[PDB]
Amino acid sequence: ENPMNKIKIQKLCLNICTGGGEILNKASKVLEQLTGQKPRLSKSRLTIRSFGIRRNEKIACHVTVRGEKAMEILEKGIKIKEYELIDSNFSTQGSFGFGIKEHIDMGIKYEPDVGIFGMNFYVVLEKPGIRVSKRKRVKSRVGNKQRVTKDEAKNWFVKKYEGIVLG
Amino acid sequence: DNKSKKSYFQRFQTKKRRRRLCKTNYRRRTKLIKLDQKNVGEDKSRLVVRITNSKVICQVVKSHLGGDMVVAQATSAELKEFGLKVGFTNYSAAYATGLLCARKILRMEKLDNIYKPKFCTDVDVVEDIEGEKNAYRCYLDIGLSRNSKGAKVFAAMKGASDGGIKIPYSPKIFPGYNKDEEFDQQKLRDRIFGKEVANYMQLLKKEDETKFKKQFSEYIKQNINAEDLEKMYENLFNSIVTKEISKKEKKDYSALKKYKVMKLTKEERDARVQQKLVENN
Amino acid sequence: VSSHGYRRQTRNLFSQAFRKHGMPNTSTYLTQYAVGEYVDIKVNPAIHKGMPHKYYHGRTGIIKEVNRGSVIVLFNRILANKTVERKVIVGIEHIRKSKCQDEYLKRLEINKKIIEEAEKKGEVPVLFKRQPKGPKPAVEMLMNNIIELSYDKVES
RNA sequence: AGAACACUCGUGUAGAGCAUAAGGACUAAAGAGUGCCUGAGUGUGAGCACUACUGCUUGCAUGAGGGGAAACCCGGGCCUAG
RNA sequence: AGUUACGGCCAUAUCUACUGAAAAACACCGGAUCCCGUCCGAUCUCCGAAGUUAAGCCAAUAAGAGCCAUGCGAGUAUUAAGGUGGGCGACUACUUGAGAAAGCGUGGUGCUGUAGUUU
């Protein structure tokens, strides 16, 4: 087969949303354990009385992982979801996402004062050369040859983890 | 939404060519080149430094109406004449190229014998010798590259200064600067003569000899060792200052015009369309 | 009633042309000026320093003094039925070199040859004046190929 | 977790913003962020708006002046009122 | 003859699909010890050559969209001067002069300056 032209992970995005006070600190400590990083707190775009959100108030924390560490977390999570995904979960862009309701399934000890949180996982796939669209000098749009398509993303998932993609 | 209607295309204004290509910053260029109306006969020279995956380029350029004129040029790939075997995009190779560039200039102007070289022993700007002709003057053009402490663009710039050209600079940008303390110049000298890489080579042989072979294969092929670098670089600098490279010859590669493709005539284009209708019916 | 600020009534003037927005081109900055040249004012709305008053837009005058990034130009104006000279300060981004002397300078180059020979051989120059177009010329015609014209078009 | 919560990928000539009328101006910015500073210096000339008051443009000299690697810029507020 | 570095005039150069490419370059590419900067060596900064023409850059193709030119529209629309011209008016004929636009047809699809490198 032709080298280059082979799929990889470029990014895994993790986010927890918990609008309020000390809850965000309690949450942040979790992300700081699952990955060796300090996560970025994010703030409310609008003011929404019903949801209990003032504008410019912190509401969530996220962290982005790349390289080897990404492989461990993704394997750890797809197990929790029992290798089962729906055709809804894949985009026209070569990316996919799922959710988890209970952080303790990723293995960490309980500590009853910390609490129970869920988490979103989102995964972005790639082929070499993407740098052409991100570098400062001579920045250009990539060729259709080097994108990742909806079918390819499913094929990669099936191959790599032996999972089942339901219609 | 946008690209769905004709009016989008009809009303659109294109950026200038070198902006579409992301090669030039026009706001920076204008501040750098704009003419002073009272200083008639002033003819500012830019020192242009650019770094490619393969090589370092120094050019000295004057901006004239209709197009920029290149006074002189030097490239790290030419240092192969003086026996440089390795690291053509290294911090040392940046400095060496700026040194080479300066000498070629001062020879043309015949200032060469008045303003002598000075290998990296202070951080002052070049100063006009009394009773003789003034130093050649230039200003630095770094393009789209970022300014930060220890960027390779500033190495070439110190090369040129040490070579005898007058550039205004502040030492804030060199390794060995301190926020509220005197300049530690041994750190600067260290990098110029390649200590930074020797120290990496030495480390890897203790850590992982497999990774060492992967990281430094080209060096191994030349039988260079970490110990050899200072002698290598001292020789390289001296030779630049001492010798001169042979002139280039001109040749007509005209015959390679065979490879150029030529556009279809009207007569052909029409027949091709006609055939396409008939193939369809 | 109308007002009297410094940029009154300049909605049409002092606006960019279609598909020509943005800052000036390099040629603007690399042009050198000298005392005694004729120069022509056209304001660039994107530059906010060194703008002249809108009366002077599109007028041509003569350079009196030259500074780092601006010029002083002499103009004449009628006020209270008398002629007044005015000295206008303008930045170099709002001016272009005038073409108004072009033909005269060519004519001077021809005169400069003749006026030397006129000392050696003649006594006075022929001086090469322009003349307005004269009467219609004479013509000799072969008289084959006649074309007839008629009110054939009825124009309902 | 809903019409409307946070995070992403692709398109995106301005359909946004620019405290305060209306017009003009602005896109690797003049918009949004981040760093440092108090030039919202000091003497003294020449001019533009129908030009007194007022507002602005610009010259020369100085500061144990600022910001920037530097070319450059700054004696209030992007320009036209307070 | 191309390319590459720095440019000039700023779409004949744009936008969308497809296809080609000797040499040398230009790139993608392999790491983070240091200098430097990030939630994140993705970007920026540094140290490298195991791979690859798949991408970009360059070039061709398309009764392509858009842009540029020219012919026609057309002596048409409008307009300066004039008369004891006409009309209740609204407006309009004539005499000596100046003179368009949209649409629609046909052709084009970057040109050049200084230096460097490659049969």
UniProtKB/TrEMBL annotation, chain A:
Gene3D superfamilies: 3.30.1440.10. Residues 2-54 form the Large ribosomal subunit protein uL5 N-terminal domain. Residues 58-137 form the Large ribosomal subunit protein uL5 C-terminal domain. It comes from the Eukaryota. The keyword Transport does not apply. It holds the Pfam family Ribosomal_L5. One of its GO terms (cellular component) is ribosome. InterPro entries: Ribosomal_uL5, Ribosomal_uL5_C, Ribosomal_uL5_dom_sf, Ribosomal_uL5_euk/arc-type, Ribosomal_uL5_N. GO terms for molecular function: structural constituent of ribosome. GO terms for biological process: translation. Keywords: Ribonucleoprotein, Ribosomal protein. Belongs to the universal ribosomal protein uL5 family. Component of the ribosome, a large ribonucleoprotein complex responsible for the synthesis of proteins in the cell. The small ribosomal subunit (SSU) binds messenger RNAs (mRNAs) and translates the encoded message by selecting cognate aminoacyl-transfer RNA (tRNA) molecules. The large subunit (LSU) contains the ribosomal catalytic site termed the peptidyl transferase center (PTC), which catalyzes the formation of peptide bonds, thereby polymerizing the amino acids delivered by tRNAs into a polypeptide chain. This is 60S ribosomal protein L11.
TrEMBL record, chain B:
GO terms for molecular function: 5S rRNA binding; structural constituent of ribosome. Keywords: Cytoplasm, Ribonucleoprotein, Ribosomal protein. One of its GO terms (biological process) is translation. The lineage of its organism: Eukaryota, Fungi, Fungi incertae sedis, Microsporidia, Spragueidae. CDD domains: Ribosomal_L18_L5e. Belongs to the universal ribosomal protein uL18 family. HAMAP family: Ribosomal_uL18_A (MF_01337_A). GO terms for cellular component: cytosolic large ribosomal subunit. Residues 229-277 form the Large ribosomal subunit protein uL18 C-terminal eukaryotes domain. InterPro entries: Rbsml_uL18_euk_arch, Ribosomal_L18, Ribosomal_uL18_C_euk. Pfam families: Ribosomal_L18_c (PF14204), Ribosomal_L5e (PF17144). This is 60S ribosomal protein L5. It is found in: Cytoplasm. It comes from Spraguea lophii (strain 42_110) (Microsporidian parasite).
UniProtKB/TrEMBL annotation, chain C:
The keyword Ligase does not apply. GO terms for cellular component: ribonucleoprotein complex; ribosome. Mg(2+) binds at residue 9. The keyword Ribonucleoprotein applies. One of its GO terms (molecular function) is structural constituent of ribosome. One of its GO terms (biological process) is translation. It comes from the Eukaryota. It holds the Pfam family Ribosomal_L21e. Keywords: Metal-binding, Ribonucleoprotein, Ribosomal protein. InterPro entries: Ribosomal_eL21, Ribosomal_eL21_CS, Ribosomal_eL21_sf, Translation_prot_SH3-like_sf. Belongs to the eukaryotic ribosomal protein eL21 family. This is 60s ribosomal protein L21. It comes from Spraguea lophii (strain 42_110) (Microsporidian parasite).
